[PDB]
C-alpha cells in the first residue's frame, strides 16, 4: 500500500437553489472569527437539527467505506444525504474548497479532497461532514476501517475515538477549556502516539469557525472557562509518526512527512447548565 497521490476531481455537485448558502460561498474568505461563543437558545435548538443531519450524512457515507470505492463516491453519498434533508454542505465553496466533505486516507492528516482515489483493503478513511441549515452549522467526523485493517491501525482508530469521548466527558461549565487537550494528549501519550498541534477544534454556531480555538494538547496557559451555551468541536488528529507534515499543491490535503498513518474523530458539543450534550450524536 503505497503513499497516496491525487486523483481526478469530479465536477462541482449541484445544490438546489432553494437551499440557503452560507454567506461565504463563492468568496475567497468567510465572515467569521468574532461571533459570540455562547449561543442563544434559538441557535442551540437549530444546532441540534444541523448536528443530527451532519451525523446522518457521516453515517451514510461511512457505510459505503469498502475496498473498491472512491473518495468521490463517499462525497456523492454525503452530499445527497445533506441535500435530501435541506442542508447545505458547509465545506462546498468554503475558501474555495471544491467538495461537500473531506475524505482523509491513511497518511492524510485532514482536509483531503474527495476524488477518483480508490480505497483498498486495509485502509483507514476519515470522512468529515458539515451541515448548514437554519442559519447554523453542525460538524462531525469519524475514521472508518476498509476491509482487513492491521492491528496497529485498528488500535490507533479505537484509541483516537476513545481520546475524543474522554475529552467530551470532561466538558462542564466552570471547567477550564484546557482540560480537553490535557486529557487527549495524556491518553495519546500512553500508547506513544503524538497529537497534532497545528490543527485544532473550534467554536461553531452561525459561523463555521467562529474564533474560539480548542487545543487538543496540553496547554495550560489558555485561561478560557467553559460556560453554559458555549458550542465547539473536539476533533483530535492523532499520529503514529512524527508531527511534521506537508500540504499538497491542491492547497488543502495535509500529509505526514514520514507517511505513517493518522486518525481523527469529531463531534460538535454543547456546554449545558451542568455538563455536555453531543449535538452530532447519531
Ligand atoms: C479548514 S476547513 C475544515 C472543515 C472541517 N469540517 C472542520 O471540522 O473544521
Ligand atoms: Co469537521
Ligand atoms: Co470541525
Ligand atoms: Na489519516
Indicate which atom in ligand 1 lies nearest the CA of residue 266: 8
What is the distance in angstroms between the CA of the first residue and the CA of the last residue of the chain?
32
Number of domain units in the chain: 1
Strands 124-133 and 88-89, sheet pairing:
antiparallel
Domain assignment of residue 122, yes or no: yes
Closest CA to 199 of 147, 126, 274: 126
How many angstroms is it from 149 CA to the middle of ligand 2?
A: 24
Maximal C-alpha separation, the chain: 49
**Burial group, residue 73, by CB count within 10 angstroms (0-12, 13-18, 19+):** buried
- Residues spanned by the domain of 173: 37-280
Residue 33 makes CB contacts below 8 A (sequence gap 6+) with 207, 209, 210, 211
Task: Quote the crossing angle between the two packed helices 41-63 and 71-84, to the nearest 10°.
Answer: 140
Locate 145 and state its grid cell. Answer: 476501517
8-state DSSP, 100? S
177 Rama class: left (phi>0) / alpha (psi -120 to 50) / beta: alpha
CA-based nearest residue to 237, from 149, 137, 111, 109: 109
Whether 20 is covered by a domain: the verdict is no
Residue with cell 505526514: 256
Rounded to the nearest angstrom, the gap between the alpha carbon of residue 269 and the centroid of all alpha carbons in its chain is: 13
Q: How far, in Å, CA of 201 to CA of 182, rounded?
A: 14
Please, what is the angle between helix 151-168 and helix 179-190, to 10°?
160
- Fill in the DSSP letter of residue 41: H
All three cell numbers of 138: 453542525
Cell readout for 129 is 461532514
How far is Cα 235 from Cα 223, in angstroms, rounded to an integer? Answer: 20
Distance 233 CA to ligand 2 centre (A): 8
Q: Which atom of ligand 1 is nearest to the CA of 94?
A: 2
Positions at the binding site for a divalent metal cation: 128, 139, 202, 235, 266
Among residues 122, 128, 152, which one has the least CA distance to residue 241?
Answer: 152
Cα separation, 239 vs 259, whole angstroms:
10
Cell numbers 470532561 correspond to what residue? 170
* Binding-site residues, ligand 1, Cβ < 6 A: 91, 128, 130, 139, 233, 235, 266
Q: Is residue 226 part of a domain?
A: yes
DSSP per residue, 249-277: TTS--EEETT---EEE-BEEEEE-SSSEE
- Cα 53–chain centre separation: 14
Nearest atom (ligand 1) to Cα of 202: 9
| Number of CB atoms found within 10 A of residue 106's CB | 25
Ligand 1, residue 233: give the atom nearest the CA.
8
200 CA distance to ligand 1 middle (Å): 9
Question: What residues are paired with 88 via a beta bridge?
Answer: 132
Asked whether residue 142 is domain-assigned, the answer is yes
Please list all protein residues whose beta carbon sits less than 5 angstroms from ligand 2, which is an ion. 128, 139, 141, 266
Ligand 3 centroid–CA 139 distance in Å is 5
Q: The C-alpha cell of 130 is what?
A: 458539515
**Do 252 and 216 touch, CB atoms closer than 8 A?**
no
d(CA 167, CA 217): 11
Q: Tell me the resolution in Å.
A: 1.6
Asked, for residue 118, whether it belongs to a domain, the answer is yes
Q: Is the dihedral of CA 271, 274, 279, 282 positive or negative?
A: positive
| Residue 194 in grid coordinates | 503524538
SS3 breakdown of the chain: % helix, strand, coil, rounded to 5?
Answer: 25, 25, 50
Q: What is the DSSP code string of 93-104?
A: TSTT--SSEEEE
Contact 209, 32 (CB under 8 A): yes
Residue 146 lies in a domain: yes
Ligand 1 mutation pick, 139, 143, 205, max ligand atoms within 8 A of CB: 139
Determine the distance separating the centroid of ligand 2 and the alpha carbon of 49, expressed in angstroms.
16
Would 243 be classed as within a structural domain? yes
Question: Which triple of cell numbers denotes residue 205?
Answer: 454556531
Contact assessment for residue 202 and residue 215, using Cβ atoms and an 8 Å cutoff: no
The CATH number of residue 71's host domain is: 3.90.230.10
Cell numbers at 144, concatenated: 472508518
Residues paired with residue 245 on neighbouring β-strands, in sequence order: 256
Whether residue 210 is contained in a domain is answered as yes
Using CA positions, which residue lies closest to atom 5 of ligand 1? 128
Mark the binding-site residues, compressed into ranges: 111, 128, 139, 202, 209, 235, 266
Distance CA 140, CA 242 (A): 25
**Using an 8 Å Cβ cutoff, are 231 and 44 in contact?**
yes
Residue corresponding to grid cell 488543502 = 252
* Ligand number with the minimum distance to the CA of 201: 3
Amino acid at each position: 500500500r503505497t503513499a497516496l497521490s491525487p486523483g481526478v476531481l469530479s465536477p462541482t455537485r449541484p445544490v438546489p437553489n432553494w437551499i440557503a448558502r452560507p454567506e461565504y460561498v463563492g468568496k475567497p474568505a468567510a465572515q467569521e472569527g468574532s461571533e459570540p461563543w455562547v449561543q442563544t437558545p434559538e441557535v442551540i435548538e437549530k444546532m441540534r437539527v444541523a448536528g443530527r443531519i451532519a451525523a446522518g450524512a457521516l453515517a451514510e457515507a461511512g457505510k459505503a467505506v469498502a475496498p473498491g470505492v472512491t473518495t468521490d463516491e463517499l462525497d456523492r453519498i454525503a452530499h445527497e444525504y445533506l441535500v435530501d434533508n435541506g442542508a447545505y454542505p458547509s465545506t462546498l465553496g468554503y475558501k474555495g474548497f471544491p467538495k461537500s466533505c473531506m475524505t482523509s486516507l491513511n497518511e492524510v492528516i485532514c482536509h483531503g479532497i474527495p476524488d477518483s482515489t480508490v480505497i483498498t483493503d486495509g485502509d483507514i478513511v476519515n470522512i468529515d461532514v458539515t451541515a448548514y441549515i437554519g442559519g447554523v452549522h453542525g460538524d462531525t467526523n469519524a475514521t472508518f476501517p476498509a476491509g482487513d485493517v492491521a492491528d496497529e491501525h485498528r488500535l490507533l482508530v479505537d484509541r483516537t475515538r476513545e481520546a475524543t469521548m474522554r475529552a467530551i466527558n470532561t466538558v462542564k461549565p466552570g471547567r477550564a477549556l484546557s482540560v480537553i487537550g490535557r486529557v487527549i494528549e495524556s491518553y495519546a501519550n500512553r500508547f506513544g502516539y503524538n497529537v497534532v498541534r497545528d490543527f485544532t477544534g473550534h467554536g461553531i454556531g452561525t459561523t463555521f469557525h467562529n474564533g474560539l480555538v480548542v487545543l487538543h494538547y496540553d496547554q495550560p496557559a489558555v485561561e478560557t472557562i467553559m460556560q453554559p451555551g458555549m458550542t465547539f468541536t473536539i476533533e483530535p488528529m492523532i499520529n503514529l509518526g512524527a508531527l511534521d507534515y506537508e500540504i499538497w499543491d491542491d492547497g488543502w490535503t495535509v500529509v505526514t512527512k514520514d507517511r505513517k498513518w493518522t486518525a481523527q474523530f469529531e463531534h460538535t458539543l454543547l456546554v449545558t447548565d451542568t455538563g455536555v450534550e453531543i449535538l452530532t450524536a447519531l
